[PDB]
Amino acid sequence: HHHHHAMALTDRGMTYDLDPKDGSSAATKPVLEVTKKVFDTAADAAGQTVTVEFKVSGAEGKYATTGYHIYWDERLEVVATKTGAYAKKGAALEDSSLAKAENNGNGVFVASGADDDFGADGVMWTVELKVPADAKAGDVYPIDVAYQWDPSKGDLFTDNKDSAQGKLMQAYFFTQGIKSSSNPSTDEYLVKANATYADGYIAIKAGEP
């Protein structure tokens, strides 16, 4: 009955509304997993820099063009790469000669392109996030992968030709391959954080007490 919001994160993800919207029949069904790091105590977690991976599976050699949004709990501090970027490409994008991370506040937009379907399974991107000094037992800092769209452009996960199968794969990616308000996480930590639209997190076990 009551409405609940995350502590330091908003749900920017939008409803996937491109035809086809239902990716259940896609020949390729990509899933993106985001790190779920759990510390035992506040002392263990305070001031720690955590490597957060965004890892795709089910799509080896089946994609070429990607673009999606990542956001994180505002209390976390991103540790930029030597170039100032908030994210760094991983082995999954090794054969994609276009890859770009674009900073976006408590988040980053990450995109890739390839001259054929050279997208691979594995880590697409990593982001280093630092846990605040005043972290406390029970804290959860959610990390969200989100689909966004507007009349000018939208997020992408398709093949080199952007074929019918590419568009099916894309619908699947955004509607079933990531979590969102339409496909919520049931992860206890995300439920606690009131951020079931999010995908991963850095969490600290609750005390006893």
Using CB under 5 A, which of 69, 75, 89, 179 touches Ca ion? Answer: 179
117 binds Ca ion (CB under 5 A): no
Using CB under 5 A, which of 91, 164, 181, 188 touches Cl ion? Answer: 164
Using CB under 5 A, which of 15, 41, 97, 163 touches Cl ion? Answer: 163
Nearest distance in Å: CB 163, Cl ion: 4
Q: Across the strands, what pairs with 68?
A: 110
Record the tokens describing residue 87, joined without a space: 């994210």
199 marked as part of a ligand binding site: yes
Backbone φ and ψ for 192, nearest 5 degrees, come out as -60, -40
Site for other proteins in 75-104 (CB under 8 A): 97-98, 100-104
Using CB under 8 A, which of 162, 164, 188, 207 touches other proteins? Answer: 162
Lookup result for tokens 């979590």: 179
180 binds Ca ion (CB under 5 A): yes
Cα of 91 vs its chain's centroid, Å:
16
When the beta carbons of 103 and 163 are compared against Cl ion, the nearer one is 163
When the beta carbons of 25 and 103 are compared against Cl ion, the nearer one is 25
Judge contact between 145 and 173, C-beta under 8 A.
Answer: no
Nearest distance in Å: CB 174, Cl ion: 11
User: With CB cut-offs between 5 and 8 Å by kind, which of Ca ion, Cl ion, other proteins, none does residue 53 bind?
Assistant: none
When the beta carbons of 92 and 156 are compared against other proteins, the nearer one is 156
User: With CB cut-offs between 5 and 8 Å by kind, which of Ca ion, Cl ion, other proteins, none does residue 109 bind?
Assistant: other proteins
Q: Give residues in contact with other proteins (CB under 8 A).
A: 64-67, 69, 97-98, 100-105, 109, 111-116, 148, 150, 152-156, 158, 160-162
Q: Give residues in contact with Ca ion (CB under 5 A).
A: 144-145, 179-180, 197, 199
Q: Give residues in contact with Cl ion (CB under 5 A).
A: 163-164
